[PDB]
Amino acid sequence: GFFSFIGEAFQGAGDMWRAYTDMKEAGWKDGDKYFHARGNYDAAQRGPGGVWAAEKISDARESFQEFFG
Amino acid sequence: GFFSFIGEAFQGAGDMWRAYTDMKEAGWKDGDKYFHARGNYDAAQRGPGGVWAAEKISDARESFQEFFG
Amino acid sequence: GFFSFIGEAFQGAGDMWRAYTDMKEAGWKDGDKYFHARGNYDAAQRGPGGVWAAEKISDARESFQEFFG
Amino acid sequence: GFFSFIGEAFQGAGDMWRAYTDMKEAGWKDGDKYFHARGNYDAAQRGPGGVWAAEKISDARESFQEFFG
Amino acid sequence: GFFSFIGEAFQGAGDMWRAYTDMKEAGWKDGDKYFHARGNYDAAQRGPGGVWAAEKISDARESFQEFFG
Amino acid sequence: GFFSFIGEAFQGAGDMWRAYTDMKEAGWKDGDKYFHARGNYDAAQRGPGGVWAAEKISDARESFQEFFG
Amino acid sequence: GFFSFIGEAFQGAGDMWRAYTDMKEAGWKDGDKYFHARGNYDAAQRGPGGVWAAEKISDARESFQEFFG
Amino acid sequence: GFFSFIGEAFQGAGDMWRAYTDMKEAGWKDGDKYFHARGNYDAAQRGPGGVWAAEKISDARESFQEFFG
Amino acid sequence: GFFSFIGEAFQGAGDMWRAYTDMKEAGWKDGDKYFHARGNYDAAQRGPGGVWAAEKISDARESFQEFFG
Amino acid sequence: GFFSFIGEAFQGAGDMWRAYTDMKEAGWKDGDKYFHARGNYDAAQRGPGGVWAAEKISDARESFQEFFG
Amino acid sequence: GFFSFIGEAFQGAGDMWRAYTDMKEAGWKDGDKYFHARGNYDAAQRGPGGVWAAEKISDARESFQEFFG
Amino acid sequence: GFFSFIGEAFQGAGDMWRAYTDMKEAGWKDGDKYFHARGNYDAAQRGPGGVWAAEKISDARESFQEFFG
């Protein structure tokens, strides 16, 4: 079992990034979730970058290179 | 089992990025979710970048290269 | 089992990016979801970039290259 | 089993990007979903880029190259 | 069992980054979650960078290199 | 069992970064969570950097190098 | 890269079942190989059985069944 | 990189079941190999059985079954 | 990198079941290999059985079953 | 890097089951290898059994079962 | 790095089951290896049994079961 | 680094079950190895049993069970 959560440059109000992986005879309740935004400036910003999602990189030679100038 | 969640440059109000993977005799309730936005400036912005989604990269030679100038 | 969720430059109100993969005798309820937007400026923006979706890259030589100028 | 969800430059209100892959004797209810937009400017924008969807790239030589000038 | 949560440049109001992995005869309740933002400047900002999500990198030679200039 | 939580550059109000891993006949309640922000300047900021999430790096030669200039 | 060698019921003298998969500036020499057989009884025998050679079986339902009576 | 060698019911004299997978500026020599057999009885024998060679079996339901009576 | 050697019911004289996987500026010599057999009885024998060679079995339900009667 | 050698029911004379995985500026010599057999009875015998060679079994339910009667 | 050697029911004369994994500027010599057998009875015998060779079994439910009657 | 040697029911003459894992500027010599067998009875015998070779078993439920009757 592999679980990898990664969050960047985000604004939230609730109930995020959760992993439930074994749960017998379980019960739960969540409530209301409000996002209210007025008059903001430059919220939720991210620069450049690549996103590599794999289950297994093997014998990667001279690979996975990112250059920023 | 492989689970990979990656979030960037996003604005949210609730109930995001969740993984439930084993659940017998389970029960749950979620509530209302409101997004209210007025008069914002430059929200939810992302720069350049590539998104590679694979299950297995093998013998990648001189590969997976991104250059930014 | 492979599960890869990747989200970028997005604005949301609820119930996103979820993976349920094993669930016997399960039950659930979700609520109303409202998106209300007025007078915004430059929301949900993304720069350039390629999206590679594969199950297996093999012997990729001098491949998968993106240049930004 | 391969599941790859990738979302970019999008605005939403609810119930998106979900994967249910094993579910015996299951039951669920979802609610109403409202999108209300007035007077916005430059919402849901994306730059250039190619979308490669495959199940297996093999011996790709000097391939999969995108140049931006 | 592998669980890796990593959060950066984010603003929140509640109930984030949680892992429940073994829970028999369990029950829980969560409350309302409010995000209220007015008149902010430069919130939720992130610089450049790549995100590598794998389950196993093997024999990576001269790989996984990022240069910032 | 592996559990790794890492948080950076984030502002919060409650109930974050929690791991529950063995819990039989358990019960709990959480309360309301409010985030209220007005007139701030330069909140939730992060510099550059890469995020490597793996379950096992093996024989990595001359790898995993990041240069900042 | 996939390499699967399977040998059964065979008699040999040399230089069998070899896989060379990456070799730059390499050199090698092999010698003479003699098989001499006289007066044997019941050499190199195999019973029944099917040989399935594929690169990927998917959603095989109630399939790949061999019965021996 | 995947390498799987399986040998059964075989008689040999030398230089079998070898995998060379990375070798720069390499050199080697092997010698003569003699098999001499006289008057044997019941050498190199194998019973029944199927040989399944794949690169990936997925969602195989009630499959891959062999019965011996 | 995956290397799996499995040998059964075999008679040998030398230089078998070898894996060389990284070797720069290497050199080696092997000698002569003789197999001499006279008058044997019931050498190199194997009973029934199936040989499954894969790189990844996923969600195999009620599968991979062999019955011997 | 994964290396798994398993040997059963075999008779040998030398230089078997070897793994060399990192070797720069190396050199070696091996000698002659003789197998001489006369008048034996019931050498190199193996009973029934299946051989499963994979790189990763996932969510195997009620699978990989062998019955001997 | 994973190295697993397992030997059963075998007769040998020399130089078996060796793992060399890091060796710079190394040198070695091995000698002659003789197997001489006459008039034996019931040498190198093995009963039933399955051989499972994997790099990672995950969420195996009610699996990997062998019954002997 | 993982090294696991397990030997059962075997007869030998020399130079077995060795692991060399770090050796710079090393040198060695081994000698001749003789196996001489006459008139033996029931040498090198093993009963039933399965051989499981993995690098990581995870969440194995009601698994890895062998019954002998």
* Closest by Cβ to I68, choosing from J45, J54, J68: J68
CB contact under 8 A, B53 and D14: no
Among partner residues I33, I53, I55, which is closest to G6 by beta-carbon distance? Answer: I53
Among the residues of L1-69, which ranges form H helices?
none
Give this entry's resolution in angstroms: 3.5
Taking the CA of residue F56 and the nearest CA in chain E, the distance in Å comes to 5
CA distance J6 to chain C (A): 28
Determine the Cα–Cα distance for residues J48 and A55; give it in Å rounded to an integer: 35
DSSP string, D29-40: E---EEEEEES-
Q: How many CB atoms lie within 10 A of CB E32?
A: 19
Q: CA H7 to CA G17: how far, in whole Å?
A: 9
Experimental method: cryo-EM
**Nearest CA-CA partner of G67 in D51, C2, H65:** H65
CA distance C35 to D11: 9
Within 10 Å of residue C14's Cβ, how many Cβ atoms? 33
Structure token pair of residue I38 = 């006279």
- List the beta bridge partners of residue J69: none
DSSP B16: B
Q: Which of A34, E34, B26 is nearest to F31 (CA)?
A: E34
| Contact across the interface for K40 and J40, Cβ inside 8 Å | yes
Break chain H down into helix, strand, coil percent, rounded to 5.
Answer: 0, 50, 50
Residue K49 in tokens = 């049994």
Q: L with K: 3 or more CB pairs under 8 Å?
A: yes
Burial class of residue H35 (count of CB atoms within 10 Å of its CB; 0-12, 13-18, 19+):
buried
Question: Do I26 and H26 form a contact (C-beta atoms < 8 A)?
Answer: yes
Which residue from E35, A4, I49, A44 is spatially nearest to J49, judged by alpha carbons?
I49
Q: How many residues does chain G have?
A: 69
- Give the CA diameter of chain K: 54
Expressed in percent and rounded to 5, the helix, strand and coil fractions of chain C are: 0, 50, 50
Are D52 and C50 a contacting pair at CB < 8 A? yes
| F67/E67 Cα distance (integer angstroms) | 5
CB contact set of H39 (below 8 Å; sequence gap of 6+): G38, G39, G40, I38, I39
Helical H segments across E1-69, by residue range: none
Q: What is the DSSP letter of E11?
A: B
Longest dimension (CA), chain I: 54
Rounded to whole angstroms, the Cα distance separating A43 from J16 reads 64
Gap between the Cα atoms of A51 and K43, Å rounded: 58
Is H9 in Cβ contact with G14 (below 8 Å)? no
Q: How far apart are CA I35 and CA K35, in angstroms?
A: 10
Please give the Cα distance from B35 to E32 (Å, whole number). Answer: 14
| Among the listed residues C52, F35, H19, the one whose alpha carbon sits nearest the alpha carbon of residue G22 | H19
| C-alpha distances in Å from residue J22, one per residue of D67, F46, H47, I57 | 38, 41, 39, 30
Residue contact H12–G16, C-beta within 8 A: yes
Select from A7, A36, A49 the Cβ nearest to the Cβ of E10. Answer: A7
Residues of C near A (CB-CB distance < 8 A)? Answer: 2, 4, 6, 8, 13-14, 31, 47, 49, 68
Amino acid at I55: E
Q: Is L30 exposed, middle or buried (0-12, 13-18, 19+ CB in 10 A)?
A: middle
Residue I23, token pair as written in the block: 């070797």
CB contact under 8 A, G14 and I35: no
Residue F59 CA: distances (Å) to CA of D24, H40, I39, L4:
43, 48, 50, 19
Phi, psi angle pair for I24, to nearest 5°: -105, 135
Please state the separation of Cα G49 from the chain's center in Å: 14
Contact E1, L56 (CB under 8 A): no
Of J33, J35, J51, the CB nearest to H6: J51
Q: Exposed, middle or buried by CB within 10 Å (0-12, 13-18, 19+), for C42? A: middle
CB atoms within 10 A of CB F47: 16
Provide the strand spans (E) within chain J. 2-8, 19-20, 23-29, 33-38, 45-46, 51-53, 57-58, 65-68
Asked whether I59 and D1 are in contact (CB, 8 A), the reply is: yes
Which chain E residues are closer than 8 Å to A46 by Cβ?
Answer: 9, 46
Quote the minimal CA–CA distance from C1 to chain J in Å: 7
Q: Give the residue from chain B lying closest to A61, CA to CA.
A: B61
Q: CB A55 to CB C13 under 8 A?
A: no
Kindly state the DSSP code that residue H58 receives in the 8-state scheme: E
**Cα dihedral angle (E21, E27, E31, E37), rounded to 10 degrees?**
10
